[PDB]
Design a protein around this ligand. Structure first.
Ligand SMILES: *[C@@H]1O[C@H](CO[C@@H]2O[C@@H](C)[C@@H](O)[C@@H](O)[C@@H]2O)[C@@H](O)[C@H](O)[C@H]1NC(C)=O
Ligand SMILES: *[C@@H]1O[C@H](CO)[C@@H](O)[C@H](O)[C@H]1NC(C)=O
Length: 495
């Protein structure tokens, strides 16, 4: 009934042998297995992992009836932590795994596809298991969209969301929506021992490498690159089917293996964002190998509102730059977020970059070990099956008052904290805000204070608490917590 840190992928490998569909994940796991095992050992030496209940866990990949990376890293983490995993990837496997006053599973990891299938399967008993769902939703689901009646009342047209879960049951690829939990993935290193001793030998050159494998992504960026070029060589890894948009002076390497790319990143001073693709791993991989990242700034920020790429998403989350995580959670000196319309700002950033030495940096949360700490913490401390939650600890709460036009998400972030939605239920009374009157409302923007009238508005619907949302007129009362540098998902007391 207690859980045992596994270090032998044999049992796993036979589990993942049972479908061709799993081959790509098998290969990923096999490749990283040494890193994965050093990780679980290393964690078990800095953390007592000896006192944990073995949990029976469904995982259902509707996807199989980016993602597969996260699935790989999740499934692997569940194994190394010693839990009893039932992988399903078909209606029949799911239907079999399911069909006294007990529960047949304690955790369920699933994607949006699988959730429709899970619901259709369990029918009425849905409710007996919904507190256990952990929904892999890369782009996230904001409370305004999760909550069906309210979405309808706001006239939202997207068929997505409307599941009425606790929004912390949504698991995202990057920490962009603090209404949801951050699961993430591991940024792979393709370097063995001989490469490590060789990684040293590589002398870094005053040369740039452009981010983008496709000629399309380069379109109308000549002015931007010409500024880079002024000061350093410009290398690419572009699939050269067409080169219509590639300046003549670009030194193309073509598509490289992960191994070869990492060696190239080691002789590169600057990795250059073109503005697409949005929040991918490549810039983390660059920063890890000691490159700086030139991060195009978005004015206005891009969202489901103004960008065809995001239309229909059940979230109004905005991108302030091509890589908001790199912008907010790494920043200078490693990351230089700059407006491409501001030619002077770009030139300055490039001049500044060329005159600083910066050490490599991989955030703890995007390693095998950080991921294991992070998932272990969610499994051991995050329970929705016993009503209102007590983790993270209330000791972590630090209230801020967002000014009109500012979300709780922003006010916490701008003060180097993260909005913690589980603290919202404790902001129910005024005990620099004193009310002369209060009312109840079912709105994502409350609790709110009107400092003109000294009128407070409290949340009347537990499912409408939102880190997301700004009041045009009023101040929002906001629950923030501290977080660990490199491990945003946790606070210091979160232990
Ligand atoms: C890389 O550049 C370092 C600093 O560069 C300086 O500023 C740029 C804008 C130019 O003015 C450049 O000539 C200056 O040195 C140098 O200290 C260093 O030698 C260079 N390293 C390599 C690998 O070439
Ligand atoms: C590292 O990988 C390369 C590339 O295939 C291989 O030839 C080399 O022998 C490896 N070195 C070690 C120490 O595993």
């Amino acid at each position: 009934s207690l859980a045992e840190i596994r270090t032998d992928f044999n049992i796993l490998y036979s589990m993942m042998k049972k479908h061709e569909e799993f081959r790509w994940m098998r290969l990923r796991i096999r490749r990283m297995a040494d890193a994965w095992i050093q990780a679980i050992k290393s964690l078990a030496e800095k953390q007592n992992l000896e006192k944990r209940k073995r949990k029976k866990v469904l995982v259902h990949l509707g996807l199989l009836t980016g993602e597969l990376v996260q699935w790989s890293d999740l499934i692997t983490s569940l194994y190394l932590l010693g839990h009893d995993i039932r992988i399903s990837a078909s209606l029949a496997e799911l239907k079999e795994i399911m069909k006294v006053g007990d529960r047949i599973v304690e955790l369920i990891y699933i994607d949006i596809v699988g959730l429709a299938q899970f619901k259709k399967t369990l029918g009425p008993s849905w409710v007996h298991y919904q507190c256990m769902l952990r929904v892999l939703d890369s782009f996230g689901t904001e409370p305004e969209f999760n909550h069906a009646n309210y979405a309808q009342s706001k006239g939202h047209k997207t068929p997505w969301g409307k599941w009425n879960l606790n929004p912390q049951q949504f698991y995202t690829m990057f920490p962009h929506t603090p209404d949801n939990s951050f699961l993430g993935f591991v940024v792979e290193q393709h370097l063995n021992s001989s490469d490590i001793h060789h990684i040293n030998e590589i002398k870094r050159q005053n040369q740039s490498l452009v981010y983008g494998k496709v000629d399309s992504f380069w379109k109308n960026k000549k002015i931007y690159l010409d500024i880079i070029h002024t000061y350093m060589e410009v290398h690419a890894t572009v699939y050269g089917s067409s080169t219509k948009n590639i300046p003549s002076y670009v030194k193309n390497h073509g598509i490289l293996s992960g191994r070869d790319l990492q060696f190239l990143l080691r002789e590169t001073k600057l990795f250059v964002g073109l503005g697409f693709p949005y929040e991918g791993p490549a810039p983390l991989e660059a920063i890890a190998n000691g490159c700086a990242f030139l991060n195009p700034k978005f004015n206005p920020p891009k969202s489901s509102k103004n960008t065809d790429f995001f239309i229909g998403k059940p979230t109004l989350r905005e991108l302030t730059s091509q890589h908001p995580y790199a912008e907010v959670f790494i920043g200078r000196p490693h990351v230089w977020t700059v407006d491409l319309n501001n030619q002077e700002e770009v030139e300055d950033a490039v001049k500044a970059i060329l005159n600083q030495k910066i050490e490599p940096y991989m955030p703890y949360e995007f390693t095998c070990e950080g991921m294991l700490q992070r998932i272990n913490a969610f499994i051991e401390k995050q329970d929705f099956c016993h009503g209102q939650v007590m983790w993270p600890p209330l000791s972590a709460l630090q209230v801020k008052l967002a000014e009109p036009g500012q979300s709780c998400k922003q006010v916490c972030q701008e003060s180097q904290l993260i909005c913690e939605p589980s603290f919202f239920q404790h902001l129910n009374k005024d005990k620099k805000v004193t009310c002369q009157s209060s009312e109840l409302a079912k709105d994502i923007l409350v609790p709110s204070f009107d400092p003109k009238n000294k009128h407070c508005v409290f949340q009347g619907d537990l499912l409408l608490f939102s880190c997301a949302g700004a009041h045009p007129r009023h101040q929002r009362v906001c629950p923030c917590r501290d977080f660990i540098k490199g491990q945003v998902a946790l606070c210091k007391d979160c232990l």
